[PDB]
Amino acid sequence: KIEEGKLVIWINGDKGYNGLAEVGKKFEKDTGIKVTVEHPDKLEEKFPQVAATGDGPDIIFWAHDRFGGYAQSGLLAEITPDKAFQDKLYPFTWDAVRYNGKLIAYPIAVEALSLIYNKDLLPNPPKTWEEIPALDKELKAKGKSALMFNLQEPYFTWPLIAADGGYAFKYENGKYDIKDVGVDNAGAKAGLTFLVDLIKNKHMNADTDYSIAEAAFNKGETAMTINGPWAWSNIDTSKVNYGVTVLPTFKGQPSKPFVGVLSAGINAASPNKELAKEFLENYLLTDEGLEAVNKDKPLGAVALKSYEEELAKDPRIAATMENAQKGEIMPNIPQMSAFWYAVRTAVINAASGRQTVDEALKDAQTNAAADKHVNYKVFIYDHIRQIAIPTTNLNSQSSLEDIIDESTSCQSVSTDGSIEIDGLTLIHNFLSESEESKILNMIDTVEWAQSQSGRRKQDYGPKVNFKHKKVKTDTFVGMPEYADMLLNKMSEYDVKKLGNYQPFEMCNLEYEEVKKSAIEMHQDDMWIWGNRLISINLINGSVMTLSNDNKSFLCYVHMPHRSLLCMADECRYDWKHGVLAHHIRGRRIALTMREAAKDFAEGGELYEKYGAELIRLGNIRVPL
Numbered sequence: 001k002i003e004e005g006k007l008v009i010w011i012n013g014d015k016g017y018n019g020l021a022e023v024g025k026k027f028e029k030d031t032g033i034k035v036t037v038e039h040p041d042k043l044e045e046k047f048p049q050v051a052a053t054g055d056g057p058d059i060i061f062w063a064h065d066r067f068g069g070y071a072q073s074g075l076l077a078e079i080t081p082d083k084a085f086q087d088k089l090y091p092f093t094w095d096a097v098r099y100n101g102k103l104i105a106y107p108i109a110v111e112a113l114s115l116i117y118n119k120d121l122l123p124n125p126p127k128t129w130e131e132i133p134a135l136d137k138e139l140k141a142k143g144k145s146a147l148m149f150n151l152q153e154p155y156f157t158w159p160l161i162a163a164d165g166g167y168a169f170k171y172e173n174g175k176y177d178i179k180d181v182g183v184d185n186a187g188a189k190a191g192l193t194f195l196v197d198l199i200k201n202k203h204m205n206a207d208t209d210y211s212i213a214e215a216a217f218n219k220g221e222t223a224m225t226i227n228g229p230w231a232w233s234n235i236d237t238s239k240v241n242y243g244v245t246v247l248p249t250f251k252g253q254p255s256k257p258f259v260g261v262l263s264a265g266i267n268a269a270s271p272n273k274e275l276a277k278e279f280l281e282n283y284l285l286t287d288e289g290l291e292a293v294n295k296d297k298p299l300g301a302v303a304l305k306s307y308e309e310e311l312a313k314d315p316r317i318a319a320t321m322e323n324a325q326k327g328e329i330m331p332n333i334p335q336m337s338a339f340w341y342a343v344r345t346a347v348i349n350a351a352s353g354r355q356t357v358d359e360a361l362k363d364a365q366t367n368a369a370a371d372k373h374v375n376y377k378v379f380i381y382d383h384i385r386q387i388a389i390p391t392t393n394l395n396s397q398s399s400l401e402d403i404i405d406e407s408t409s410c411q412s413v414s415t416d417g418s419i420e421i422d423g424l425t426l427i428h429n430f431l432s433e434s435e436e437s438k439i440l441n442m443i444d445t446v447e448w449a450q451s452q453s454g455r456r457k458q459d460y461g462p463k464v465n466f467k468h469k470k471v472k473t474d475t476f477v478g479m480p481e482y483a484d485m486l487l488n489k490m491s492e493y494d495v496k497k498l499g500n501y502q503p504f505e506m507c508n509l510e511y512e513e514v515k516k517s518a519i520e521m522h523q524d525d526m527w528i529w530g531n532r533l534i535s536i537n538l539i540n541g542s543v544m545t546l547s548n549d550n551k552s553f554l555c556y557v558h559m560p561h562r563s564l565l566c567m568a569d570e571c572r573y574d575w576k577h578g579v580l581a582h583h584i585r586g587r588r589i590a591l592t593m594r595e596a597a598k599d600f601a602e603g604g605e606l607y608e609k610y611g612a613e614l615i616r617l618g619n620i621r622v623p624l
């Protein structure tokens with residue numbers, strides 16, 4: 001679980017986490033309680049997975065739109081400010097962190113996108129999006145460009161998409177109606193069409209992301225960007241003569257940015273809820289606390305009335321709230337993340353030209369009512385040609401029967417649009433029936449242990465605290481007797497791919513269809529386990545589901561009974577794998593192996609502390 005007596009805090013990497021850690025020091029200096037501020041990548045996706053097992057940070061910072069999904073599953077403690085503390089923050093900020101009539105987080109700051117422009121290049125910024133193409137031709141002739149901003153996150157393109165009519169969910173009768181989505185109406189297509197036309201006409205590049213746009217603006221190479229308050233600190237230190245103003249209109253109408261309230265939720269599994277309440281209320285949500293965070297990266301219009309008064313004069317804040325007035329505060333309902341996931345894909349796919357605007361927004365409309373796999377392009381693995389074949393017969397919910405059908409049908413299909421997955425290897429009939437019987441009779445002489453998600457396990461190897469990087473070898477007395485016959489047979493079949501394999505862990509995983517056993521999508525640890533992950537299908541076959549978030553690809557790999565799978569290189573480091581429960585039939589044992597990581601092998605950094613000991617134990621054999 002979560003350690004008592006200290007506070008662990010998650011906040012995104014674009015916010016002032018170093019200022020927040022300074023508030024944590026003042027907390028530690030006063031209370032002796034250590035505060036540790038972390039900025040994990042994808043923290044907003046990790047928090048629901050680790051909080052639901054009783055783990056994670058005591059306090060999570062994000063915009064409020066994420067928090068209704070968390071609260072729905074019970075991952076956020078109700079917060080209990082007294083009336084005097086409630087009166088210290090603007091009421092509208094409290095309403096952004098209300099879910100089913102309960103306060104679920106503290107509001108910190110109000111954020112909205114603005115147009116940021118270089119006054120020395122562009123003293124009169126455009127009032128309209130429509131005049132940017134001609135603005136770019138003028139500036140292109142002078143070695144500059146008009147406008148660069150993050151095209152990879154729909155947050156930055158949403159103001160333009162909403163402007164002429166796009167919306168997430170209609171607000172009607174005091175509620176958000178999830179049955180009425182507006183991402184494929186005329187207004188949304190008009191705005192995304194304009195964005196895609198800007199890219200077709202080379203006024204923007206569909207690959208531009210947050211860091212590329214920020215550097216270009218901050219080096220003085222583009223006349224405009226679009227960003228929020230957290231970005232101003234980096235502009236300041238580059239001494240570009242910038243201003244902050246209203247976003248341009250589109251088709252005569254204002255751009256409508258989704259307004260975020262940066263918010264602090266308290267993990268429901270936390271045993272430190274009183275310490276978190278003390279920190280947030282009397283250390284962070286003070287003039288001195290907010291100033292420390294603001295001096296690192298600006299927060300926007302803070303929720304605390306006293307410190308906002310001291311900030312009202314700032315013209316950048318005034319422009320932020322002018323844009324906020326033209327947009328809307330985001331919903332916080334659970335479906336907001338499905339909305340964003342869907343719109344993220346439409347924008348990427350239309351901008352790249354892979355899909356037209358109409359079909360990209362038609363797909364996002366459908367998926368905004370949904371599991372981010374629904375948005376990915378689906379492939380089936382052709383084990384003969386050893387490529388993944390794009391298929392529209394399969395989706396993220398396809399049955400085992402449909403996947404098995406497709407994995408033979410796909411072999412007579414054109415290779416167009418196919419991909420290779422480097423380091424995916426499938427060996428169809430690795431074990432004979434009698435070798436499998438031999439191993440299975442040995443395995444069922446050994447005790448099974450209860451594990452996660454309806455699996456049982458036999459574990460041969462060290463106890464590993466992955467989070468603390470600590471290893472115990474008390475339980476590690478060797479590898480199972482059948483390890484040699486497997487390792488030799490791996491070397492005989494394909495020495496280049498499966499040889500020189502020193503098993504650091506062998507682990508049998510038992511699935512039963514009656515128990516709904518499964519294993520969630522994951523990447524296996526890369527601190528102690530090395531490149532090649534081996535899995536051998538005993539008793540029954542199944543499907544390894546592979547996903548690539550970076551590319552939005554979903555690939556089904558049918559693993560027939562007695563096949564060997566090896567996931568290495570790209571397949572191991574760029575993709576996730578898992579076994580969905582509805583792809584298990586009867587009983588299956590996955591006979592898995594990990595090899596040593598490089599830090600643990602004969603020339604690594606932890607070879608002396610752990611690696612040499614693990615090699616000795618892994619060389620001895622347990623008789624059956």
Ligand SMILES: OC[C@H]1O[C@H](O[C@H]2[C@H](O)[C@@H](O)[C@@H](O[C@H]3[C@H](O)[C@@H](O)[C@@H](O[C@H]4[C@H](O)[C@@H](O)[C@@H](O)O[C@@H]4CO)O[C@@H]3CO)O[C@@H]2CO)[C@H](O)[C@@H](O)[C@@H]1O
Pocket residue numbers: 012014042043044045063064065066111153154155156228260337340341344549550
């Ligand atoms: O692999 C796809 C991507 O999935 C992950 O990003 C998701 C998030 O998990 C979703 O929550 C959502 O993100 C929203 C976000 O909730 C919303 O607040 C706003 O984010 C702003 C933020 O308010 C602002 O303070 C500042 O930090 O910039 C953010 C925008 O970058 O808008 C987001 C949508 O753009 O949707 C995305 C998917 O788009 C994962 O984190 C990604 O690494 C991953 O690539």
Ligand SMILES: O=C(O)CNC(=O)C(=O)O
Pocket residue numbers: 509519524533534535577578579590592
């Ligand atoms: O094969 C299975 O059932 C699940 N296996 C893995 O996640 C793996 O081999 O790393």
Ligand SMILES: [Mg+2]
Pocket residue numbers: 522523524533577
């Ligand atoms: Mg795995």
